[PDB]
Design a protein around this ligand. Structure first.
Ligand SMILES: Cc1[nH]nc2c1[C@](c1cc(N3CCC(CC(=O)O)CC3)cc(C(F)(F)F)c1)(C(C)C)C(C#N)=C(N)O2
Ligand SMILES: Cc1[nH]nc2c1[C@](c1cc(N3CCC(CC(=O)O)CC3)cc(C(F)(F)F)c1)(C(C)C)C(C#N)=C(N)O2
Ligand SMILES: Cc1ncc(COP(=O)(O)O)c(CNCC(=O)O)c1O
Ligand SMILES: Cc1ncc(COP(=O)(O)O)c(CNCC(=O)O)c1O
Ligand SMILES: [Cl-]
Lengths: 442, 442
């Protein structure tokens, strides 16, 4: 008693918007540092009937019947996760049920510290995430600043994590957890030093490696599994999986954490797992372990180095004057424009990027930069030689943005009136499309 | 720089488990009240490249570029949600970004009362959800009993909601929210009478209609939208959509609730929305509004009545001795067997159900019943005349379970040794598969 007519016939309205979204993705230079494109095998999982199953609990301990094949999928995902990040099932555990990044981080924090527990994370304005305790003087913006007591550590004026400040803060504030691993931080993390500060004050070491996960798994960047008690990560960014998250916990260093983390996920916060996600994660984690994926990940940093280098050669300032990973933050103060403005200008030419704060900015309204990153375009086949072209396009967008500000003024509402019809933007878009639309599309 | 080999080639191991899940689903009598089967159109959306997009925030106010077609999908889903539940976009708003039911309920309660806030909900043992403030004397099982202060109202020994107790509890406890709508409660709700109690102590009226959503939409059961301040609902049960959730808020009765709920979802708890979900929910919400889905929903209650009636005529006791909705709770005390045992017996014959508490039980270990429901089988084309057979299979399961208890004893580990190879279980399984494997499978 159902309708099995295809999507095209059942819902032509929705199907057209998705055919459109598909074309837009195909014809865009995607520089969002947090975005990638999944292969068809991961999209077959997400489409799979396994999402019919309620399977609350953990494998073998299900509150529903008919979970025989679900428990295998869940166990196969856990194994492949522990295998992908080069850790032993003897000392490291993994929960694979968190629905996304922010859910995973709030759950893992809760497990460790409980309500009104004390936590430390990097400031949003300095590169830290919302779920790292972010608040404003005016409001508790993240739940992690309200359901927990949080304190935030700023980076230095050059854009680097100030370990002198972290230690000054940890001794006075005395938190149960210290968060590192970040949302828009272009450099590597000394986890060892974080461990020594955590050990000084008997706080837990929390490393959220969502942005840099692939690098960690492939031993291109520092390994926080050597020092951290908990490691959180999303699966949908550089790792190139579905939208999901993973909580890793260190059993050797903290026995009985397994029960605490598992109980935090369910039944503390979530109910039924999303099994199509779990299936999809499993499929991408087998890819993560291959030598082919290492090659891709290497290409990400190769492209990122080249991109930063080509932007500096065109006199554009970068936060920390470069990058160790997949991402760059462009400081736009020398041009007297904002990232809100450059994001719209880039939206008009099919260049996807996001506004981003910098160290000198006192407000998240009027951010003075944009962040870009290479995972997506590296997935589309772009090489080091291609980065000059992307640098060329970003430079012209900045120049066009200066002109449109000159003509129409600093107000953003006024600035947008400048965008539609602009001949240079039309010629530039045309250039973006012609090149982007040609690349391999998964 | 990717692998576009299909799932079968890239991951034969996983592909075989999913082909196996597919066959199990096809050859099972699914009586899990919370489960359904999604059509191929809903499954195309979940597999769609729209899940590549980071679109944090709300439509027109995105922290990322390239969100033009995503904004159309998110506004189209909101439209179709308000349309489906027969509410005016002037009076009611809807957030469509919650990732699942438990996330939606925690977020909405936060919006309303905040950390340390007071809430009231039905006890788990009486039919209420974990997210309705459930705790135990030992521990705060749900975050909703820890991040909030909760008190729990039980039903009487008859299995019915006791409004005398609710009011008595509300006057003394004075919560800011009162939750109604439930997980395994077989009768309709007097929302109007809940509204009268909420107004007396100036509390919000929270209706969670996840289990009964389709009835509310198609006007077969009471309408909480006439009285409630907030309505939550999952989209993956009787509504027959993807795994997602929806928070409805009454703007007219509570000016300023819109921002407060929209900010609880993001940036308070979640980050990037899962767009494939939103696409999928939009697709099913169009189906919900047709007269054909009303037909399906009517057939759900026709089957439920017949199923209750046919179980009573085989001398099986039901809580409240019947049902007004899609679900029944079988009380198994007279047979001296637990729900755990009957769930295992039923899994050996390809009958999916779940264990469930009843009013007389003091513990959730050793629950005295099981819960069943008709949404899934009604989707597969089963009619009233088919319910006698399901009732007969369940009767035979109960009988077999008493025998297996008699032979191997009360211990559950001992009991399962009895299951493998049993001649009448093989005979019954055979009978289950033959009928189930013949029915329409979306
Ligand atoms: C949207 C989001 N989530 N997590 C983030 C961000 C980022 C971000 C957040 C905000 N927020 C998002 C929530 C907002 C609170 C509200 O809405 O009431 C406070 C500022 C603002 C910006 C930018 F605009 F660039 F300054 C960027 C980026 C990645 C989009 C960010 C930065 N900078 C960092 N560090 O992390
Ligand atoms: C799994 C789950 N989620 N929400 C539910 C349930 C149900 C349920 C929950 C529990 N729980 C789940 C959390 C558990 C807490 C812990 O581990 O520390 C306490 C008992 C136990 C049962 C049953 F076994 F039948 F008694 C049923 C059902 C629908 C599966 C339930 C009941 N009865 C109700 N009312 O709601
Ligand atoms: C370090 C980090 N942690 C957690 C999250 C949360 O992920 P979900 O979006 O799945 O909740 C993000 C999101 N990153 C935002 C961005 O960098 O674009 C992040 O950067
Ligand atoms: C009333 C109610 N509310 C919320 C949820 C949470 O849904 P998620 O599983 O999407 O978190 C459930 C699921 N209850 C499980 C069941 O009845 O089988 C529920 O019954
Ligand atoms: Cl999904």
């Amino acid at each position: 008693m159902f309708n099995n007519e295809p999507l095209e016939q059942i819902d032509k309205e929705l199907h057209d918007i998705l055919a459109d979204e598909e074309k837009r993705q195909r014809e865009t230079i995607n520089l969002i540092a947090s975005e990638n494109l999944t292969n068809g095998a991961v999209r077959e999982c997400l489409g799979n009937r396994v999402s019919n199953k309620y399977s609350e609990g953990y494998p073998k301990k299900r509150y529903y019947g008919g979970n025989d094949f679900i428990d295998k999928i869940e166990e196969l995902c856990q194994k492949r996760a522990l295998e992908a990040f080069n850790v032993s099932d003897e000392e490291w555990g993994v929960n694979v049920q968190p629905l996304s990044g922010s859910a995973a981080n709030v759950q893992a924090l809760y497990a460790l510290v409980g309500v009104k527990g004390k936590i430390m994370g990097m400031h949003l304005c300095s590169g830290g995430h919302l779920t790292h305790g972010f608040f404003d003087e005016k409001k508790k913006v993240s739940i992690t600043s309200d359901m927990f007591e949080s304190k935030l550590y700023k980076c230095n004026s050059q854009g680097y994590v100030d370990l002198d400040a972290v230690r000054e803060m940890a001794l006075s504030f005395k938190p149960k957890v210290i968060i590192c691993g970040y949302t828009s931080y272009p450099r590597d993390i000394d986890y060892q030093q974080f461990r020594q500060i955590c050990d000084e004050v008997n706080a837990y070491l929390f490393a959220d490696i969502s942005h840099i996960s692939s690098f960690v798994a492939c031993n291109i960047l520092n390994n926080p599994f050597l020092h951290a008690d908990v490691v959180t990560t999303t699966t949908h960014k550089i790792l190139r999986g579905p939208r999901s998250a993973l909580i890793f916990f260190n059993k050797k260093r903290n026995p009985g954490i397994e029960q605490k983390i598992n109980s935090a996920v369910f039944p503390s916060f979530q109910g039924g797992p999303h099994n199509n996600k779990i299936a999809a994660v499993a499929c991408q984690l087998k890819e993560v372990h291959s030598p082919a994926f290492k090659e891709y990940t290497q290409q990400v940093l190769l492209n990122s180095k080249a991109l930063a280098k080509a932007l500096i050669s065109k006199q554009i300032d970068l936060v920390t004057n470069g990058t160790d990973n997949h991402l760059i933050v462009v400081d736009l103060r020398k041009f007297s424009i904002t990232g809100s403005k450059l994001q719209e200008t880039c939206n008009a030419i099919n260049v996807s990027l996001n506004k981003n704060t910098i160290p000198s900015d006192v407000d998240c309204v009027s951010p003075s930069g944009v962040r870009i990153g290479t995972p997506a375009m590296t997935t589309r086949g772009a090489k080091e030689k291609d980065m000059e072209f992307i640098a060329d396009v970003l430079a012209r967008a900045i120049k066009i943005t200066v002109d449109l500000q000159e003509q129409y003024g600093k107000k953003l509402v006024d600035f947008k009136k400048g965008l539609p019809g602009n001949a240079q933007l039309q010629q530039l878009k045309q250039e973006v499309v012609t090149w982007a639309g040609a690349l391999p599309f998964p």
